Amino acid sequence: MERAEILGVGTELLYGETLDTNTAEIARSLKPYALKVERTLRVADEVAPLAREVEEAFARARLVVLSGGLGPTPDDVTREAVALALGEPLELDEAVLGEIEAFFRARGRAMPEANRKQAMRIPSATWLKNPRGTAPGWWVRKGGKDLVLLPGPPPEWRPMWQEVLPRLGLPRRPYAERVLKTWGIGESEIVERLGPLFVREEEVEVGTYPKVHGVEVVVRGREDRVAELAERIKKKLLKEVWGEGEMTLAEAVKRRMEREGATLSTMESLTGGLLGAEITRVPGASRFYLGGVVSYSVGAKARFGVPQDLLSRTVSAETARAMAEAARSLFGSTYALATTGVAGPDPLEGEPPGTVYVALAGPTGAEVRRYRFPGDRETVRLRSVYAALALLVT
Amino acid sequence: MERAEILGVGTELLYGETLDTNTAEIARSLKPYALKVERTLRVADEVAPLAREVEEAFARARLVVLSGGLGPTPDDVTREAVALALGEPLELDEAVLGEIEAFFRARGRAMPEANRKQAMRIPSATWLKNPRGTAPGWWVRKGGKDLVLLPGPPPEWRPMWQEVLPRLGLPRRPYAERVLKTWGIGESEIVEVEVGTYPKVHGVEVVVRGREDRVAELAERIKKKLLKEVWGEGEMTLAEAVKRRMEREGATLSTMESLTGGLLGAEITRVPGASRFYLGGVVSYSVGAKARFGVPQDLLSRTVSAETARAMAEAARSLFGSTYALATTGVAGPDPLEGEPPGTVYVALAGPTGAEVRRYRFPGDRETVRLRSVYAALALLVT
Ligand SMILES: O=C(O)c1ccc[n+]([C@@H]2O[C@H](COP(=O)([O-])O)[C@@H](O)[C@H]2O)c1
Numbered sequence: 001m002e003r004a005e006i007l008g009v010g011t012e013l014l015y016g017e018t019l020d021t022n023t024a025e026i027a028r029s030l031k032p033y034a035l036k037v038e039r040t041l042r043v044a045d046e047v048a049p050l051a052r053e054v055e056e057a058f059a060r061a062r063l064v065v066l067s068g069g070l071g072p073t074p075d076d077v078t079r080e081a082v083a084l085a086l087g088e089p090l091e092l093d094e095a096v097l098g099e100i101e102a103f104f105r106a107r108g109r110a111m112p113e114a115n116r117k118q119a120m121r122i123p124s125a126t127w128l129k130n131p132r133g134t135a136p137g138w139w140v141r142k143g144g145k146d147l148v149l150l151p152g153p154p155p156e157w158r159p160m161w162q163e164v165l166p167r168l169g170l171p172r173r174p175y176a177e178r179v180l181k182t183w184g185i186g187e188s189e190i191v192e193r194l195g196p197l198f199v200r201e202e203e204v205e206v207g208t209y210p211k212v213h214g215v216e217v218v219v220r221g222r223e224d225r226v227a228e229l230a231e232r233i234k235k236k237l238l239k240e241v242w243g244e245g246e247m248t249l250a251e252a253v254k255r256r257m258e259r260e261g262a263t264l265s266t267m268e269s270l271t272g273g274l275l276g277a278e279i280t281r282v283p284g285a286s287r288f289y290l291g292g293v294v295s296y297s298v299g300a301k302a303r304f305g306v307p308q309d310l311l312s313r314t315v316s317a318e319t320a321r322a323m324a325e326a327a328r329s330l331f332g333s334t335y336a337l338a339t340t341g342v343a344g345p346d347p348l349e350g351e352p353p354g355t356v357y358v359a360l361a362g363p364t365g366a367e368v369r370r371y372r373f374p375g376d377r378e379t380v381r382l383r384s385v386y387a388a389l390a391l392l393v394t
Numbered sequence: 395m396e397r398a399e400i401l402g403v404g405t406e407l408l409y410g411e412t413l414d415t416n417t418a419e420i421a422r423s424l425k426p427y428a429l430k431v432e433r434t435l436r437v438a439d440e441v442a443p444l445a446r447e448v449e450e451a452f453a454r455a456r457l458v459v460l461s462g463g464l465g466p467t468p469d470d471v472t473r474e475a476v477a478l479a480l481g482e483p484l485e486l487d488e489a490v491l492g493e494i495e496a497f498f499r500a501r502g503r504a505m506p507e508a509n510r511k512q513a514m515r516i517p518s519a520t521w522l523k524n525p526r527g528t529a530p531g532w533w534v535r536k537g538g539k540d541l542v543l544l545p546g547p548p549p550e551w552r553p554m555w556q557e558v559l560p561r562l563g564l565p566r567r568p569y570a571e572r573v574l575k576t577w578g579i580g581e582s583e584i585v586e587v588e589v590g591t592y593p594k595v596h597g598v599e600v601v602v603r604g605r606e607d608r609v610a611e612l613a614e615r616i617k618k619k620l621l622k623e624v625w626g627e628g629e630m631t632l633a634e635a636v637k638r639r640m641e642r643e644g645a646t647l648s649t650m651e652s653l654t655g656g657l658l659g660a661e662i663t664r665v666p667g668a669s670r671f672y673l674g675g676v677v678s679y680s681v682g683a684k685a686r687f688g689v690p691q692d693l694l695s696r697t698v699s700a701e702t703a704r705a706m707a708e709a710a711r712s713l714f715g716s717t718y719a720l721a722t723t724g725v726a727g728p729d730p731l732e733g734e735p736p737g738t739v740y741v742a743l744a745g746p747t748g749a750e751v752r753r754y755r756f757p758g759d760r761e762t763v764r765l766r767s768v769y770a771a772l773a774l775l776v777t
């Protein structure tokens with residue numbers, strides 16, 4: 001498989017001052033095509049370094065895509081750079097110059113001379129119309145290779161790109177992907193269970209991406225390889241997969257509650273309201289979620305029904321059970337979740353950061369799970385939230 | 395001026411399945427130093443391409459930083475790629491092995507075979523202790539150049555990178571940033587070395603950056619022009635400002651939240667030491683729950699109102715016995731409530747001398763409305 005290279009031009013994208021979503025979007029849009037994306041670049045607004053990256057990228061790929069640096073500032077050097085890298089000269093197109101003039105004249109303004117550049121092209125570039133902005137793009141065909149320049153702003157470039165893409169004559173390859181979301185299983189366990197199913201090849205591949213919400217397993221490549229390989233992996237992970245694709249844990253909880261016609265409530269400590277936050281992230285949460293308490297202080301725990309004898313060991317399975325049972329009784333809900341633990345940095349009751357109990361109570365009784373999460377304060381609180389949510393959807 | 399090269403390693407990074415903020419964060423941390431950053435890369439999880447990019451980045455740079463691919467899986471190939479790109483062999487270090495093993499034992503687990511590979515380094519590498527993961531980092535000093543390997547997730551690599559960065563003995567340049575964070579005043583009114591305004595959910599930030607001498611003076615001037623609007627600087631957050639008030643006063647705080655759904659209590663407890671003052675909260679998501687925690691029956695058909703906001707704050711104050719209490723009620727969206735558009739939000743504070751309400755019409759989606767609500771509630775105590 002040949003390569004596609006993708007370059008976002010702009011100094012501020014380096015620093016994350018503007019978030020570079022362009023290169024990623026452009027890469028997703030190449031999924032249906034038999035091309036390999038090994039890398040993406042963000043390059044500063046200087047012509048020499050940029051000309052070198054274009055030149056290197058173009059030497060290795062069948063396709064090169066640039067995004068941004070087509071404005072009228074001294075910081076807009078993309079045209080020059082592509083010009084310098086490909087050995088062709090910049091020529092003024094009088095016609096396009098008129099069109100730029102016309103864009104300004106439709107707003108009562110004369111065209112600044114700054115914008116004169118924006119009408120240059122190289123012999124090998126045909127133009128791509130930008131009815132939505134000043135800078136029109138280029139399509140270079142040369143040596144059996146395509147190079148495309150796009151404006152940075154997404155509303156300007158999405159339509160141009162969607163339009164020139166089908167035209168580039170790139171090699172199609174039916175593509176699929178399956179995203180499997182698990183919980184309660186680590187990366188190395190998944191490795192072991194899958195063994196040889198952990199394929200990393202040109203036709204199909206598998207990878208894992210540990211998240212606060214459990215380990216995600218993505219299979220991606222040729223349609224027919226992904227289908228059968230992914231189903232085999234789902235089989236191996238049957239009990240730990242809680243959802244697929246866009247599915248989220250809060251969403252999963254919501255469908256169980258609708259299915260049962262059941263209600264839920266919460267009693268939270270270390271997480272501090274974050275579990276309720278997460279439950280209510282999903283539109284429609286007021287149909288089942290009665291509410292919850294955040295019992296951050298000992299006094300608050302005693303007030304909301306944690307038994308006095310447990311108040312010296314709030315970080316325990318017994319307390320988590322009591323908390324969830326208490327919430328259930330206090331809210332009259334079919335289910336209740338509870339969280340108790342140590343987020344860190346400080347220990348509590350002689351237990352170290354990441355010590356966490358999550359409990360579910362319901363009609364037929366209660367259950368508790370124990371974790372030792374690594375992470376800082378924010379991380380432990382987050383994993384606790386998904387841990388509590390996992391109790392309901394295993 | 396010598397180069398610094400920055401590579402985020404993850405196929406998911408190419409496709410923005412996760413957004414690459416790592417490379418940019420590293421790049422911004424490097425601003426006080428006299429290196430140029432000409433580009434940053436995201437590389438797929440493939441050993442050969444990655445060795446090529448590493449080899450190349452090393453040949454042109456004074457500093458190379460990599461982030462990601464230190465896990466135990468077949469897709470984690472950063473250590474193999476760098477070994478390759480530096481013509482050195484990977485060698486198990488039995489001391490680190492015992493440390494990962496200790497790590498797993500502490501969690502009541504046996505160390506899985508796949509983790510063994512995380513104790514492997516090249517002879518040129520020094521370990522960077524990972525206080526929060528199994529994968530320590532690498533620091534290679536070779537030919538006056540540095541290459542630093544870091545874990546992908548920020549809670550792991552942040553302190554590592556902090557610890558390691560002064561130690562690289564980079565040439566300094568006198569650059570600085572000063573962030574002044576405001577509440578209750580739009581960009582336009584503010585306008586009335588470089589200076590920028592940045593609108594955030596916690597308010598418009600005024601940023602001053604450039605030559606440290608220029609930044610320090612010009613920033614003390616700006617602060618003065620906006621002396622009433624500026625609630626903090628630098629790393630200060632609304633939650634921390636609130637904490638500072640509660641300790642200064644020896645006061646306590648509690649909350650009753652509905653649309654924000656627990657996010658306010660979450661924000662409050664984001665900061666270490668919250669339990670010295672934050673007694674707790676109620677998430678009154680349903681009407682039945684409002685009733686039960688002391689909101690008057692009379693107000694239950696008008697939950698989106700100043701009256702209900704007031705009652706919620708009084709009800710939290712009485713229920714928990716706190717000095718102060720915050721409340722939120724309103725419409726986050728996508729759905730209207732009781733004829734009120736998304737963005738209609740009432741935040742309330744009750745204390746010793748009574749209660750106050752602020753009404754807001756907040757633009758944005760469900761999450762955005764909830765976030766701004768949380769900060770508006772906090773702003774009651776610190777603006
Ligand atoms: O703040 C409130 O009083 C309040 C309490 C519960 C729900 N809401 C809003 O109710 C609307 C329906 O909520 P939900 O959770 O079913 O999406 C939605 O716009 C929520 O923001 C608002």
Ligand SMILES: O=C(O)c1ccc[n+]([C@@H]2O[C@H](COP(=O)([O-])O)[C@@H](O)[C@H]2O)c1
Nearest residue numbers: 269270340341343344348666667668669
């Ligand atoms: O879940 C709990 O029982 C609980 C309640 C209050 C505090 N903690 C934890 O104990 C320490 C409390 O400190 P802090 O930073 O909230 O003052 C810290 O590790 C919190 O995560 C934990």
